[PDB]
Amino acid sequence: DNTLLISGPFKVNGVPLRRVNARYVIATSTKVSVEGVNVEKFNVEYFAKEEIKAERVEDQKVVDKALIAEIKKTPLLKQYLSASFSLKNGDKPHMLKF
Amino acid sequence: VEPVVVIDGKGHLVGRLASVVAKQLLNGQKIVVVRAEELNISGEFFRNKLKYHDFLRKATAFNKTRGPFHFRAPSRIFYKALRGMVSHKTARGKAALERLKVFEGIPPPYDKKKRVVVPQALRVLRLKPGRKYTTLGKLSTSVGWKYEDVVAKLEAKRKVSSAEYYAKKRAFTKKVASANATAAESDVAKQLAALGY
Amino acid sequence: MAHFKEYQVIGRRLPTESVPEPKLFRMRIFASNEVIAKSRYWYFLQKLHKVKKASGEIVSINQINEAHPTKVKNFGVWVRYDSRSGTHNMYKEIRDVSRVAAVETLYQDMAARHRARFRSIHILKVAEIEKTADVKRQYVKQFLTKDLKFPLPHRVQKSTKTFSYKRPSTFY
Amino acid sequence: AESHRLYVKGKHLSYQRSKRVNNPNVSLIKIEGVATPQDAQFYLGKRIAYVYRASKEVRGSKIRVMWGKVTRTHGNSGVVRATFRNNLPAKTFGASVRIFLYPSNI
Amino acid sequence: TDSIVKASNWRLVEVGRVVLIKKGQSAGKLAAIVEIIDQKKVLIDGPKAGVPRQAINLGQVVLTPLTFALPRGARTATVSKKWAAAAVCEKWAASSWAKKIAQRERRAALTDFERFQVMVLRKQKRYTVKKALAKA
Amino acid sequence: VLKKNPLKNKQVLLRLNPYAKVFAAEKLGSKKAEKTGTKPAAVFTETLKHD
RNA sequence: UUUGCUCCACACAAUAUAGAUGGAUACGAAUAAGGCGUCCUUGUGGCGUCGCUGAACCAUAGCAGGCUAGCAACGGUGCACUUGGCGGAAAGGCCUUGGGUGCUUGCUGGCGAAUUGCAAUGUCAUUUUGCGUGGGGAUAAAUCAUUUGUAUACGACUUAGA
RNA sequence: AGAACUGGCGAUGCGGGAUGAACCGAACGUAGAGUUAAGGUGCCGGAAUACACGCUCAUCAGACACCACAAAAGGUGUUAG
RNA sequence: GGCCAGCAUCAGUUUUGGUGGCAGGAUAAAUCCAUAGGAAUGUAGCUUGCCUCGGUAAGUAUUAUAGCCUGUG
Q1: 8-state DSSP, B62
Q2: Which end of chain C is less congested by CB atoms within 10 angstroms, N or C?
Q3: Does residue C119 share a domain with residue C136?
Q4: What is the CATH number of the domain that holds C82?
């Protein structure tokens, strides 16, 4: 549906498996190998409205373990992923390398 | 970029600074001008005294009390040049003029705050070396301003207090640099230098 | 009138039955484009020979480049101009890097010091000064002195901010 | 943290206008930090929101928001042209305005 | 008795004086003055930095305190030889001017992840400075 | 009901001028010329650089 | 003139806005010259270093920012108090002492976030006034009328009368 | 004041010349977007306190066609010849 | 199934960048390389005359312990 499937991970910053639009997202340069993840199960019909449904909770726990293993490889990435991005005084987004 | 910008009027040109401030006032930026008695005007002293006398004789014939008001203070002379650069007869132009404060010397709390200059308005950066210039404080005294010695006495007292503050600040800054130099030769100092810090 | 170029233009004075193969006059024209260069060529042949644009054609137009475009030379230029009163002849020397660049500054200098527009200046000759001490103007002699070093005892560097937090310094 | 700003501050200068005639349909916005049309090209299409306070309670809040977008550059000093859904009240000449980073192209 | 007069050292426009182009296509490269055309135009050559030999205006360049012996009107091959012999590019990189310049593209090249790491590192360093400053 | 401009709409650019498909095959606009190099006579060079 | 008036802590309301959303971050002076550091016979001194913009500096990580466990430090910082000093140009601010308490991301952890469902400023200011709780304080005048004539067209002015 | 040719005003708004029946640009259904004319880009005022070469200091400088005035004659003022 | 918006893929009009392949000129001119000739705002050397053991000062000297210019390829 032209959207992006994202994860925090939920254990790191509290952002679960969610769906967002690509136009409201700034893509940075930090890269993590996602070639250990079972993303093909999730699709458009997976996010159907029809509190929090119980079955999707363990899907969040089975996906985040495949990322936090590699997050611990590069130092300070876990603390980086738990910190909110913000613009400070003097910051110019037209020259800020992301 | 700042809530209130304090501009030091010393060494500036009355016309090039007013046009800078008038544009900033219309954009919604509050401007405070201090030391208006040290403003500079291009041309010799006799040129500007004759120009003010031409302005001084302009008054309404049948009632002098409702004609052009010839203000003598250096702050108001700079204000008169700035007032004609703003559409002051409209509501938008009146609101811009309430964002401006001009004083002789450096008044209270604006004396404890940082003062800036306008690079495209300094006399040293616009005038050819050799051109004659006039000081606004001397010109105002020759046309009827009687507070030159009062401001000069208060300004001399202020500089003594600010010199004592700078001695404490300069000594404290040297103590900070000694601890920052000892912070070098460490792991966190070399890692910061790799990232341009 | 613009950033100049140097052209060579050849007219022919179109053949009649009585006179085939004419003399093929040639000039060097300083202009911005080929259209003005051909126009200035006909303007001068109309001042020297019984020929105009309708009575002749342009055989060839070629752009002349500097042989050494990056070697500083001294150029002695003779000009004839029209003033508000009459016509006068000048000789000036310009120290520059090419014939085209030296001509470009001459039009700026002629307009600045004599109020002479482009339409009122005729370039008689642009010639190179081969030897030192053949330069006759003092403002060119100054830069031919041995071991020339001159400072700039003032520094107005341009700024980009309306406000600066330190007073500028003109050290140099 | 101390700052939660995800936008850049701007200033409503005036409408698109001639010497004596103005066009309220197009507003001129000065974005801080921008001084060239080349740097202003990054902000093309970015969403503009004007936050102002009202008196009557509308939906449990006294703040109403007027939305817009950056259309093109204006001049050689980084000023940009803006068209909002509804034109600005012309009393906001010099008022602060918010330019967001979305829709993002980075 | 002393006859002191202040010297007030200045950067002279001279043959061999190294310039730094600030406006134009180069915008930050190093060149050397070859010959002086007039009071406002000079001939420069930046063969090691890639600057073509050209007649430039003095307002587009800023003189550097570096100077090396160069003959007047020396060609590009001659200029490049004396440039490497004097090691102009090595003296320039050791100056605080270039180290301040090279610092500002490094900050401009910082990614969002690196900008977070600089924040963390400055917090560790600030702890040591505050401890050392509060005990003396 | 609406004029579609060629040179930006390739489908219209293929409707008119069917040779445009062939024009893109050998690319027809970057063709390398045969390397000449015969030199002009001396009288042309002396005249060009004449005073 | 039916418990009114004023001030402080707070609670509920309305009213008002030329436009808060990391920090207005304090020598002076010169510009054909200076800043800083250091030495010295303390000078218009010697030496070193810096500029070429604030593109800086400080601040900045946590549910707009939670719940807790420690380690290393005796710091950093907020708040209510308190000690002392300075500041009158529009001072109404600045510096500093003592402890109390909270936080600390300087370092190592353990849980909590989702469903606000793909963006809808997502409310976070202070301004005056009103109204109630209760913690202190204060206990008047002016005008008309009468009168005076240093005043006066009329108002005004100048006086007087428990 | 009286003729010749043509274009205009009168019968004509619009952008520009601060201002004007004639000048410059351009002529007009109702709207949107883009690009320009003439004229402008220190501020009033939308747009470079752009760049480049020079000239000028004026104890009544100068600043833009129509246009709202200035001369003969002078100056060891300064610049170029 | 209205009203107000977002995104995607398109069409029409248009604005602002990045980048590729070619064709022309003196088949750019230069730089560069090779060769010959030459000059001074005359490099080393030589020589002369002053001088805090060397730094200058004017004669010689056409590339040497610097270089440049011009022609040709």
Answers
A1: S
A2: N
A3: yes
A4: 3.10.20.10
Same domain as C133, residue C83: yes
Q: Which of C146, C120, C121 has the alpha carbon at shortest distance from C132?
A: C146
Q: In units of Å, what resolution does this entry have?
A: 2.4
- Domain of E31, CATH number, reads 2.30.30.30
Nucleotide nearest to E76 (CA to C1'): I31
Residue D75 falls in which region: left (phi positive, over 0), alpha (psi -120 to 50) or beta: left
Calpha distance B146→B134 (Å, rounded) = 18
D72 has which bridge partners?
A: D81
What gap in Å lies between CA B68 and CA B70, rounded to an integer?
6
Under 8 Å between Cβ of B17 and B118: yes
Q: What approach was used to elucidate this structure?
A: cryo-EM
Residue C31 belongs to domain spanning: 3-69
Task: Give the separation between CA E29 and CA E94, rounded to whole angstroms.
Answer: 16
Q: Cα C47 to the chain's mean position, in Å? A: 20
Q: At what angle do helices B45-56 and B136-143 cross, to 10 degrees?
A: 40
User: Do C56 and C76 fall within a single domain?
Assistant: no
Asked if C75 and C141 sit in the same domain, the reply is yes
- Report CB contact under 8 Å: A29, E110: no
Q: Determine the nucleotide nearest to C111 by Cα–C1' distance.
A: H54
With a CB cutoff of 8 Å and minimum separation 6, the contacts of E26 are E46, E49, E50, E51
* Same-domain check for residues C28 and C56: yes
Number of domains chain C is built from:
2
Q: Which of E8, E23, E34, E36 to mutate to test the interface with C (most CBs of C within 10 A)?
A: E36
CB-CB: which of C153, C154, C159 is closest to B120? C159
Q: Which two tokens stand for residue E44?
A: 């420069």
Q: Are residues C55 and C99 in the same domain?
A: no
Among B48, B38, B68, B28, residue whose Cα is nearest residue B135: B38
Chain A: nearest CA to E31, how far in angstroms? 28
The secondary structure of chain B in percent helix, strand, coil, rounded to multiples of 5, reads 50, 10, 35
Of residues E111, E112, E117, nearest to A76 (C-beta): E117
Task: List bases in chain I with any atom under 7 Å of a protein Cβ.
Answer: 4-8, 11-17, 20-33, 40-42, 66-71
Domains of chain D: 1-106 (2.40.10.190)
Query: Given CB atoms, is B92 within the 8 Å cutoff of chain D?
Result: yes
User: How far does the CA of D28 sit from the C1' of H31, in Å?
Assistant: 22
Contact B133, B41 (CB under 8 A): yes
Same domain assignment for residues C30 and C45:
yes
C171 in any annotated domain: no
- Whole-Å CA distances, D3 to A43, A87, B75: 36, 7, 39
Q: Min CA distance, F34 vs chain C (Å)?
A: 24
Q: Do chains F and C touch (3 or more CB pairs under 8 A)?
A: yes
Question: C87: Cβ–Cβ under 8 A, 6 or more apart, which residues?
Answer: C80, C81
Query: Which residue segments constitute the domains of chain B, with CATH numbers given?
Result: 1-147 (3.90.1180.10), 148-197 (1.20.5.4280)
